[PDB]
Design a protein around this ligand. Structure first.
Ligand SMILES: Nc1nc2c(ncn2[C@@H]2O[C@H](COP(=O)(O)OP(=O)(O)NP(=O)(O)O)[C@@H](O)[C@H]2O)c(=O)[nH]1
Ligand SMILES: [Mg+2]
Length: 160
């Protein structure tokens, strides 16, 4: 079976583990010894997933930032899934710009849409997509909503 390599990356607390469990079925109740590698199958193909340490940027200021940056550069994931918090877009987009700059094949998972909704915050996904030039997948991972959309967007993005 054909396999692809996928990395999850994003700010602390955005829902990386929640999405990792949702995609791969690993760590059925996280936060004891969290798995950071796993896989899922979609439309006859296999997707190996790695959950990278939470970072705010990719300079060389912490162990985690060095670990994240080395993975993208040297391991060359087929797709980087940049998970962003819908309720703190400006903060998250800093990391996002650095990922674009380094030439990563990128896909944006826009999490916590349920929180945004309940706080009256509106995100124009189609407009965000047009501006960035990157595909955007709206989801609420803790409610397990938009997970199949993410699997689908991923399987298309690895070929792009
Ligand atoms: N409202 C809402 N909360 C969410 C959603 N996804 C995750 N959360 C919450 O956000 C918090 C962080 O979840 P987690 O997935 O562990 O984030 P993380 O990115 O792995 N954190 P870390 O950087 O420490 O590894 C948890 O309280 C989780 O319940 C979502 O879709 N909606
Ligand atoms: Mg985590």
């Amino acid at each position: 079976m054909k396999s692809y390599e996928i990395a999850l990356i994003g700010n602390p607390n955005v829902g990386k583990s929640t999405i990792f469990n949702a995609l791969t079925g690993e760590n059925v109740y996280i936060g004891t010894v969290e798995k950071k590698e796993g896989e899922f199958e979609y439309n006859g193909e296999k997707f190996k997933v790695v959950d990278l340490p939470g970072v705010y940027s990719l300079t060389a200021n912490s162990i985690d930032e060095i670990i994240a940056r080395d993975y993208i550069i040297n391991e060359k994931p087929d797709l980087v899934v940049n998970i962003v918090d819908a309720t703190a877009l400006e903060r998250n987009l800093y990391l996002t710009l650095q990922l674009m700059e380094m030439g990563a094949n990128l896909l944006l998972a826009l999490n916590k849409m349920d929180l945004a909704k309940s706080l009256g915050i509106e995100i124009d996904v189609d407009k965000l997509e047009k501006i960035l030039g990157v595909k955007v997948v709206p989801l609420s991972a803790a409610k397990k909503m938009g997970i199949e959309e993410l699997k689908k967007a991923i399987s298309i993005a690895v070929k792009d």
